Amino acid sequence: MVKVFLVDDHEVVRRGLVDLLGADPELDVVGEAGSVAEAMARVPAARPDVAVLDVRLPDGNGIELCRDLLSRMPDLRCLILTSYTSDEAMLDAILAGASGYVVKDIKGMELARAVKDVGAGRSLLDNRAAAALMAKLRGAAEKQDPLSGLTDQERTLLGLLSEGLTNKQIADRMFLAEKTVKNYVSRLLAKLGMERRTQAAVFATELKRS
Amino acid sequence: MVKVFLVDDHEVVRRGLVDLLGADPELDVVGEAGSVAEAMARVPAARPDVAVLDVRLPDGNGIELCRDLLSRMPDLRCLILTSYTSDEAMLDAILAGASGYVVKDIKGMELARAVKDVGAGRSLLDNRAAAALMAKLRGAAEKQDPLSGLTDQERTLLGLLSEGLTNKQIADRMFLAEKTVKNYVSRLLAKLGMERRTQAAVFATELKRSR
Numbered sequence: 472m473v474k475v476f477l478v479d480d481h482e483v484v485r486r487g488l489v490d491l492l493g494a495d496p497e498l499d500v501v502g503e504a505g506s507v508a509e510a511m512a513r514v515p516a517a518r519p520d521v522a523v524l525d526v527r528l529p530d531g532n533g534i535e536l537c538r539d540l541l542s543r544m545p546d547l548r549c550l551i552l553t554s555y556t557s558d559e560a561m562l563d564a565i566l567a568g569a570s571g572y573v574v575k576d577i578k579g580m581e582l583a584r585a586v587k588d589v590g591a592g593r594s595l596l597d598n599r600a601a602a603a604l605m606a607k608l609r610g611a612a613e614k615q616d617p618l619s620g621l622t623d624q625e626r627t628l629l630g631l632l633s634e635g636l637t638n639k640q641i642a643d644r645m646f647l648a649e650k651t652v653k654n655y656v657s658r659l660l661a662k663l664g665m666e667r668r669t670q671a672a673v674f675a676t677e678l679k680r681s
Numbered sequence: 682m683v684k685v686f687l688v689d690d691h692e693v694v695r696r697g698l699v700d701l702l703g704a705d706p707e708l709d710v711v712g713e714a715g716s717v718a719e720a721m722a723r724v725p726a727a728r729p730d731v732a733v734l735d736v737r738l739p740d741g742n743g744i745e746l747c748r749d750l751l752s753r754m755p756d757l758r759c760l761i762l763t764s765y766t767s768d769e770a771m772l773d774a775i776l777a778g779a780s781g782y783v784v785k786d787i788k789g790m791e792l793a794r795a796v797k798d799v800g801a802g803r804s805l806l807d808n809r810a811a812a813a814l815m816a817k818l819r820g821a822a823e824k825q826d827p828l829s830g831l832t833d834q835e836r837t838l839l840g841l842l843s844e845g846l847t848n849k850q851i852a853d854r855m856f857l858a859e860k861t862v863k864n865y866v867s868r869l870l871a872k873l874g875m876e877r878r879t880q881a882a883v884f885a886t887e888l889k890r891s892r
Binding site: 512545575579580587588601603608640643 | 790799803
């Protein structure tokens with residue numbers, strides 16, 4: 472079967488999802504967490520095939536969590552709840568073996584981060600050695616660019632989201648008003664296919680499974 | 682002249698340093714900032730040669746700030762106040778053209794981060810193209826390794842610090858008690874050569890330039 476781990480800060484949503492996945496004998500809910508810390512301690516212990524995830528968490532966010540989980544467990548499949556228009560489409564994706572768009576997105580971003588890091592640290596190594604690595608690095612990140620559709624500002628914002636910085640920390644770092652950041656985050660999540668249904672619509676759906 | 686920018690959240694320390702560098706006609710204080718954000722807005726506008734910096738700030742920290750400043754301004758020389766046993770040794774280092782240890786520490790970290798990033802994002806490209814890239818990255822990072830003296834945990838902490846995370850966010854992410862983080866940070870800073878004198882001793886030194 473498919474071992475599924477649930478990550479969501481709402482009991483009501485966790486219980487509804489447990490109900491949903493329970494009716495499918497092919498699925499096996501092997502644990503749940505209501506925050507980034509819990510999931511970081513519990514997911515590598517349960518070793519699921521798939522993590523089912525809300526982007527909104529009390530102590531960070533789901534982009535941060537996915538990046539952090541993926542570096543420790545590279546083959547983990549990550550499905551954002553609001554990336555699907557319904558729980559049925561989500562369940563189909565699970566059965567289909569879908570990895571989740573956020574996975575490709577995180578890796579795209581890490582390839583691009585690597586270009587920046589070497590870029591910033593290049594005054595340490597040989598002149599010709601630096602240009603050689605720099606060339607091969609951009610080539611790899613230019614081949615694999617799932618984030619090509621984003622502006623620079625959105626790439627940066629995504630980067631900072633993936634660190635688990637708060638909206639206020641992001642605002643301070645990007646010289647934006649906090650309200651503008653909240654808007655930009657939602658614009659960015661929408662652009663990445665992660666606002667296909669609202670948070671309140673997930674809640675109303677899981678709550679009716681009670 | 683050497684253009685110097687001061688970053689410290691205590692007015693008493695900024696004034697004392699302004700007094701001190703003003704006595705030297707070879708130095709030119711070109712600006713001051715009392716936070717990460719202020720420094721981020723103001724250093725790229727003043728384009729100093731040197732930033733004189735205290736590791737503790739109200740909205741982040743100096744490792745974070747050096748990292749962010751250096752990515753936009755690669756040639757900036759960054760000198761942490763507590764990396765020197767006295768203001769005289771620090772002034773000597775400004776005169777000598779010293780870049781400051783934090784600079785190469787940060788570039789070392791970045792190289793090592795690049796290894797982890799490609800490590801993590803490698804399932805996207807060719808199996809063979811991935812390895813070749815991976816070898817060339819490690820070879821470049823272990824050849825240039827100023828952080829070699831640190832433990833893995835200290836490397837991770839240093840990375841998290843450079844993102845400007847609070848001690849609480851670091852505790853959460855590293856599964857440590859907050860007071861343990863405070864001790865590990867102070868330990869890591871001391872190991873990096875950045876606690877050659879205390880904060881209180883810097884404060885008392887600048888205070889006696891005013892009174």
